[PDB]
Amino acid sequence: GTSRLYTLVLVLQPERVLLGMKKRGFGAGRWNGFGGKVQEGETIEDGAKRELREESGLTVDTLHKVGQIMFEFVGEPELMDVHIFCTDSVQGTPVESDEMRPQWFQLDQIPFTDMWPDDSYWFPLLLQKKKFHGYFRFQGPNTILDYTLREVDKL
Numbered sequence: 001g002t003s004r005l006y007t008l009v010l011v012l013q014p015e016r017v018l019l020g021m022k023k024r025g026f027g028a029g030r031w032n033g034f035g036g037k038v039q040e041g042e043t044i045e046d047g048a049k050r051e052l053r054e055e056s057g058l059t060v061d062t063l064h065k066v067g068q069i070m071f072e073f074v075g076e077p078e079l080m081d082v083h084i085f086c087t088d089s090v091q092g093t094p095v096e097s098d099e100m101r102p103q104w105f106q107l108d109q110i111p112f113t114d115m116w117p118d119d120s121y122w123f124p125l126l127l128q129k130k131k132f133h134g135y136f137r138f139q140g141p142n143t144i145l146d147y148t149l150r151e152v153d154k155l
Contacts, residue, residue, distance in 0.1 A: 004038075004104035009086070011090055016105060017110065021034065027116060030115050035052075048085045058090040063085040068132075
């Protein structure tokens with residue numbers, strides 16, 4: 001099996017987190033961070049900044065590495081190698097698109113039942129600032145067949 005590179009960015013401040021409700025395509029109807037395919041000719045980190053800009057309108061100076069997860073969906077031919085990043089400081093207001101609608105959530109109102117089910121497993125790592133490598137195997141959007149999470153000091 002082969003894998004494609006993706007990024008996912010979470011704008012995570014001391015008491016709130018920015019999410020986008022996907023309108024179309026992958027994860028439609030769920031809140032998620034901002035991300036997409038890494039392109040030829042850009043670093044993973046630059047891809048993460050570009051996707052944040054493209055998806056939300058926001059610009060960022062500094063991203064920090066949160067973790068990395070390999071996703072396997074049984075009905076898809078490629079694995080998804082997802083590099084996850086966070087930041088607490090952005091410039092601009094997020095802009096609604098045909099692809100998504102942005103919204104801030106207080107950290108006591110994170111809507112896990114309307115997010116990808118894997119978020120329930122690794123968000124506690126995210127919120128404690130603990131880096132990790134992970135793997136999730138899915139049958140469709142709702143069923144995790146198997147998963148592994150391993151906390152690390154350095155990615």
